[PDB]
Amino acid sequence: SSAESASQIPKGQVDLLDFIDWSGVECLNQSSSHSLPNALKQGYREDEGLNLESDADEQLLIYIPFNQVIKLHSFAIKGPEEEGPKTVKFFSNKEHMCFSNVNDFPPSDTAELTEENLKGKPVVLKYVKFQNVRSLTIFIEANQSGSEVTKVQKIALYGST
Structure with missing residues (x-):
């Protein structure tokens, strides 16, 4: 999918948002009350309506496959x-x-x-x-202040092909 919105690609690294497979994304949590697209697919990243969070489990496992090897x-x-x-x-x-x-x-x-x-x-x-990189799993187990709850507004990966 051609996916952009407000992404700033500098010179050195390209956004991997468009390089994500999206179809085979897999989440063993993705917030028990929220979905994955919330913080990864730019556009939905508004912490007001939808965000990626730790519902109960602060330790979050998100699997992202890519469409191209970068x-x-x-x-x-x-x-x-x-x-x-x-x-x-x-x-x-x-x-x-x-x-x-x-x-x-x-x-x-x-x-x-x-x-x-x-x-x-x-x-x-x-x-x-x-x-x-055909596959990348993101495992976030602990947060900044050990605040039990973790909230993610946006995730972006930048690569260099």
Whole structure:
């Protein structure tokens, strides 16, 4: 799908929103009372009506398959400062995995929500590992302030093909 809205693609990294498969997206939570598109598909990212949150489980597992193989270069996740996801783990090159196994397998990268990330700034991660991305699972287990509840306004991944 050709999917944009208000995405700012700089020079260095391209948005992966349009590179997402969308059809095979899978969520083992996606908010027990909310849906996934809320924070990922730009446009619905308005924390007023719909957002991606942790309903009860602060630990959230979201699986995103892509339509093309690109390299993940930078990531951008936003939410509230207290309810923002800090412990961000990713794992690519693996289609289908629940968090039980994510504990035994080393993540692709483990990021922290920086205050700048919280503003919509693409933070660069280990590009040396992201060479082939057909699949990317995002496992967020802990939030910024340990506030029990986590809220996500928007998720954006930027890659460099």
